[PDB]
Amino acid sequence: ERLKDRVALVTGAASGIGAATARLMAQEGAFVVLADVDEHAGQALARELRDATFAYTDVSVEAQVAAAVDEALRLHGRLDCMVNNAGFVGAYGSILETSAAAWHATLGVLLDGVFYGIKHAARAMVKQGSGCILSVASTAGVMGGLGPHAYTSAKHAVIGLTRSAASELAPRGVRVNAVAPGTTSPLGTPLMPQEIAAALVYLASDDARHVNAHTLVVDSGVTVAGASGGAVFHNRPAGFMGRM
Amino acid sequence: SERLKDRVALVTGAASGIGAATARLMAQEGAFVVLADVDEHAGQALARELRDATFAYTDVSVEAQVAAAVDEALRLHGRLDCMVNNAGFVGAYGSILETSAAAWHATLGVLLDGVFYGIKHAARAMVKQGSGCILSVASTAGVMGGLGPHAYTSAKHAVIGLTRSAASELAPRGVRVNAVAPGTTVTEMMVQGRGSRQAAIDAATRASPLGTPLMPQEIAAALVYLASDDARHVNAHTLVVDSGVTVAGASGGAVFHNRPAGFMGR
Numbered sequence: 065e066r067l068k069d070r071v072a073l074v075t076g077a078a079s080g081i082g083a084a085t086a087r088l089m090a091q092e093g094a095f096v097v098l099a100d101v102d103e104h105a106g107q108a109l110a111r112e113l114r115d116a117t118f119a120y121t122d123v124s125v126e127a128q129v130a131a132a133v134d135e136a137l138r139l140h141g142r143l144d145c146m147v148n149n150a151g152f153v154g155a156y157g158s159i160l161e162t163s164a165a166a167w168h169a170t171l172g173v174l175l176d177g178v179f180y181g182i183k184h185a186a187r188a189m190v191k192q193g194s195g196c197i198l199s200v201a202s203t204a205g206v207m208g209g210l211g212p213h214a215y216t217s218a219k220h221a222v223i224g225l226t227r228s229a230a231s232e233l234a235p236r237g238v239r240v241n242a243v244a245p246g247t248t249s250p251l252g253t254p255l256m257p258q259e260i261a262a263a264l265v266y267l268a269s270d271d272a273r274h275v276n277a278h279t280l281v282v283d284s285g286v287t288v289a290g291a292s293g294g295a296v297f298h299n300r301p302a303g304f305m306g307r308m
Numbered sequence: 309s310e311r312l313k314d315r316v317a318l319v320t321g322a323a324s325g326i327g328a329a330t331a332r333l334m335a336q337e338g339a340f341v342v343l344a345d346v347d348e349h350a351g352q353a354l355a356r357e358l359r360d361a362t363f364a365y366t367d368v369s370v371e372a373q374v375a376a377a378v379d380e381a382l383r384l385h386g387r388l389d390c391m392v393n394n395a396g397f398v399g400a401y402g403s404i405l406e407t408s409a410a411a412w413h414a415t416l417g418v419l420l421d422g423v424f425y426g427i428k429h430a431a432r433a434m435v436k437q438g439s440g441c442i443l444s445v446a447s448t449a450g451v452m453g454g455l456g457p458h459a460y461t462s463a464k465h466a467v468i469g470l471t472r473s474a475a476s477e478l479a480p481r482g483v484r485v486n487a488v489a490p491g492t493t494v495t496e497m498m499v500q501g502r503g504s505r506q507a508a509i510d511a512a513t514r515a516s517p518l519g520t521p522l523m524p525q526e527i528a529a530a531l532v533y534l535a536s537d538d539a540r541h542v543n544a545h546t547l548v549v550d551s552g553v554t555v556a557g558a559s560g561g562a563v564f565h566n567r568p569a570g571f572m573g574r
Contacts, residue, residue, distance in 0.1 A: 156572060305399060
């Protein structure tokens with residue numbers, strides 16, 4: 065029970081990483097406000113979890129993000145943890161043919177939603193003098209070639225906004241961090257949404273009170289330690305090239 | 309054209325590969341070049357080829373020899389403007405389970421200790437001048453794992469850290485410290501012999517997302533850029549020359565971009 069009586073708001077909570085995070089935070093003792101556009105699935109999960117409630121929220125619409133934060137405050141009087149999460153990809157294909165409309169629609173969810181979430185959650189938290197704002201980015205936020213163009217730009221932007229927001233909010237007592245799931249392994253076993261949930265709970269816990277502006281990467285080491293490419297150097301009888 | 313006119317450069321590993329290409333280009337850009345290497349025949353031959361170049365036998369794993377090469381540059385030319393810590397050297401490879409301490413230490417002696425000695429002694433000459441540029445040839449293996457052997461990768465990461473650390477001391481003294489990170493292939497590392505030149509060109513071709521091979525002259529040009537007055541506010545930087553592999557993926561890893569443009573989601 066690492067989040068006993070904490071109040072968490074999780075966006076995109078009706079499926080994937082968002083649902084796994086709502087479940088795990090509830091299991092860890094939090095009061096969870098589930099925000100999503102899937103009303104039927106969102107309500108079903110709210111019924112399943114103890115003391116959770118659902119709030120229809122399209123994170124591309126600032127007023128709805130503000131209203132979700134406000135509803136969390138109306139129900140519980142405080143907000144301890146904000147999770148900016150979306151199970152969404154958006155525009156794909158060649159940069160030569162990506163329309164401005166597809167570009168803007170993608171950034172509206174993947175970037176504006178994070179900005180609105182940080183803005184309005186921070187408004188609630190700076191009054192408390194405490195709080196944790198967490199965004200589900202992606203390894204496409206740390207390097208290219210791992211996702212579509214708009215996806216990769218938005219996710220890099222989310223890491224930049226995470227770091228920038230942390231620099232304003234840290235002296236106010238508020239931490240801002242991101243988790244970067246892989247686009248999924250060198251370890252041979254599949255990455256599950258529950259593991260991303262567990263990374264978010266770690267970051268929200270008091271254990272992580274000095275983890276700030278950090279991007280916690282969960283990708284089996286692909287972005288910094290490609291295991292296939294290493295084999296030509298490592299998977300060999302130990303030897304020495306050159307003069308001893 | 310002549311971006312290093314009458315500047316004095318000391319280039320280690322100068323008798324071949326990147327070091328030789330750098331010595332040639334810096335001489336062409338008007339610099340007085342001291343060529344440092346343990347290959348006497350190749351080193352002396354290159355010194356005879358280049359105008360105003362001289363050879364100075366230098367094993368960079370031995371601090372005293374690095375210091376003596378700097379002193380030789382000062383004795384001959386009265387100043388040192390640019391130091392290039394370069395080694396055409398790989399060392400230990402294969403499984404970490406059976407990598408000996410001796411192989412570990414031999415590798416780091418060349419690839420890391422040699423850079424420390426070069427920064428230390430070049431900086432001693434340069435802080436007196438109030439100017440100078442210290443450059444180290446690292447590698448993409450200094451920026452991430454999976455691109456070279458274990459000792460190589462650790463040493464090259466350490467070189468980038470020492471580059472940044474030294475820059476934080478030496479910047480207010482007027483001395484810049486930077487690194488270049490060429491891409492490499494295992495063929496260039498492993499393949500030696502009489503056809504080794506073309507094998508490395510082939511390997512570099514298939515490895516580049518741009519489809520063309522990285523040549524030593526291009527790293528020489530990156531180093532000359534960093535030593536030039538154009539780069540006087542480029543400091544502690546790692547200039548990566550790898551066709552984008554470390555930050556945009558290996559060749560063929562992003563064919564999904566060529567799918568017909570579409571939109572998925574709400």
